[PDB]
Design a binder for this molecule. Structure first.
Ligand code: GDP
Ligand code: MG
Lengths: 159, 144, 103, 88
């Protein structure tokens, strides 16, 4: 079993990527407030249960939310390709997990939107500084959604 | 609590530089003043942590909880970040009293249960068993 | 740069500090101030090797790494009496007991 | 330079600076005198004690890093007792 957590900002589309991976249908205007975890038996390279944990809700640095995030062994940091709060997210994952080399994967979603305010080379340079792969993804186009979750699983295996 | 972090929520980039032969545990005193353990730093390593203004940090040896110094003092409060430059925090060994240094050495060589087997005066056993405590040092610091 | 010294003769040990760039003669002038003897009467040695007055302390081998406050480096001293320099003699320190097994 | 002379139980004689030797509260009390005699502190400990007196003073009020004071395991107990007696 592999435990994957999908961290990211508002409207960045974290729920859409996990619904695309599991339900295989694109969700329009999915509830930002609702937070649910989904389990899925998938074949990668190995039959395993890659259980996602779409994150949602208001900023809470309580002991309880920390422990909930600490449980996930793989993190998918998502940002819209249309700001730099990602370092905050990455620095907080690093705190609860107590590691500089947590299995993580930078993901720039909404990569079908023609307006990009972030350079693709800029993110992969950031991903290179972190030491983690960057997978471009489009939940509407259903492109790269599987790769991001799958490369996170391979990073967890490498760990 | 006199000794606590101010909930400023104002980001201040800081450099934690371990200039001590010991593994350093940064400890962050939270808003209620309770010490929080943060990732350790191996001897010689430097890391650009992201903290906040008015935050209150102290630093100890990670295995024995011996006290360490930061910028020639016991505590460190990130100052107003200027033109993006990081605030530097040099973690260093204090000049410990010779007695305390000896207690540190004996504590490492002798498991706690065999302190009383050592050929030392009984006053020294009580000293041996009086291990370094972050909370006890905090009360002294509040007094000062 | 400062070097830190244990000048040692018989059962007498001087702890003093000196710049690495000072000279063996300047250091004999400092032992003069302590042990009240002229440099002509004093012989300074590193290990068994005699040290010439003109050489600087760094050339002899006393450096920051070699001579430290926590672990100082030892200069032997021999005094001259009746125009005869004495054999270099440094009486050893006591020895600690065997490590207790609990240690 | 003002020195003081410290004598161990086995008759070894150590010349240290006064300011350095004043790092011990006990020694400060006895000098309050350019010679102190210790009949219970052997030479290998009182020489090691004498290196602490140079370590302190040199590294006290040091803005930069400080090296660790090394204590070999064999001398540790004796150094502990002597420090306890000397308040340093
Ligand atoms: N065009 C496009 N829209 C997306 C994509 N991914 C997410 N969205 C939209 O962005 C919004 C974000 O919703 P949600 O997934 O709840 O965001 P979250 O709060 O970050 O989880 C949704 O209305 C999605 O329809 C994408 O790849 N392309
Ligand atoms: Mg969501």
């Amino acid at each position: 079993e592999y435990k994957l957590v999908v961290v990211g900002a508002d409207g960045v589309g974290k729920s859409a990527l996990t619904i695309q991976l599991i339900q295989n249908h694109f969700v329009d205007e999915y509830d930002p407030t609702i937070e649910d975890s989904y389990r899925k038996q998938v074949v990668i390279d190995e039959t395993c249960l890659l259980d996602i944990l779409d994150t949602a809700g208001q900023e809470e640095y309580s002991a309880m939310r920390d422990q909930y995030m600490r449980t996930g062994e793989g993190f998918l940091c998502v940002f819209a390709i249309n700001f730099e709060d990602i370092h905050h997210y990455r620095e907080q994952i690093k705190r609860v997990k107590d590691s500089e080399d947590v299995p993580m994967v930078l993901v720039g979603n909404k990569s079908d939107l023609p307006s990009r305010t972030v350079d693709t080379k800029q993110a992969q340079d950031l991903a290179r500084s972190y030491g983690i792969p960057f997978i471009e993804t489009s939940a509407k186009t259903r492109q790269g959604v599987d790769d991001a979750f799958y490369t996170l699983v391979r990073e967890i295996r490498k760990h | 609590p006199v000794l606590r972090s101010v909930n400023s929520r104002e980001p201040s980039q800081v450099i934690f530089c371990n200039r001590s032969p010991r593994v350093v545990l940064p400890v962050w005193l939270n808003f209620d003043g309770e010490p929080q353990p943060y990732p350790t730093l191996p001897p010689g390593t430097g890391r650009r942590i992201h903290s906040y203004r008015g935050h209150l940090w102290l630093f100890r040896d990670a295995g024995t909880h011996d006290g360490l110094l930061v910028n020639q003092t016991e505590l460190f409060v990130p100052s107003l970040n200027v033109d993006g430059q990081p605030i530097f925090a040099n973690i260093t060994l204090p000049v410990y009293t010779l007695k305390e240094r000896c207690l540190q050495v004996v504590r490492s060589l002798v498991k706690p249960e065999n302190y009383r087997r050592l050929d030392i005066v009984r006053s020294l056993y009580e000293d041996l068993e009086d291990h370094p405590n972050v909370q006890k040092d905090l009360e002294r610091l509040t007094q000062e | 740069m400062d070097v830190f010294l244990m000048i040692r003769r018989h059962k007498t040990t001087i702890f003093t500090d000196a710049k690495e760039s000072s000279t063996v003669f300047e250091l004999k002038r400092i032992v003069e101030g302590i042990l009240k003897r002229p440099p002509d009467e004093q012989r300074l040695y590193k290990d068994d090797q005699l040290l010439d007055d003109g050489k600087t302390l760094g050339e002899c081998g006393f450096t920051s790494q070699t001579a430290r406050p926590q672990a100082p480096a030892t200069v032997g001293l021999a005094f001259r009496a009746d125009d005869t320099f004495e054999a270099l003699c440094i009486e050893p320190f006591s020895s600690p007991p065997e490590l207790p097994d609990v240690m | 330079m003002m020195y003081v002379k410290l004598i161990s139980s086995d008759g070894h004689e150590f010349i240290v600076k006064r300011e350095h030797a004043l790092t011990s509260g006990t020694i400060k009390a006895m000098l309050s005198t350019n010679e102190v005699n210790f009949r219970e502190i052997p030479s290998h400990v009182l020489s090691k004690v004498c290196m602490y007196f140079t370590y302190k003073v040199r590294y006290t009020n040091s803005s930069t890093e400080i090296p660790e004071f090394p204590i070999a395991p064999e001398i540790a107990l004796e150094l502990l007792m002597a420090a306890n007696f000397l308040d340093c």
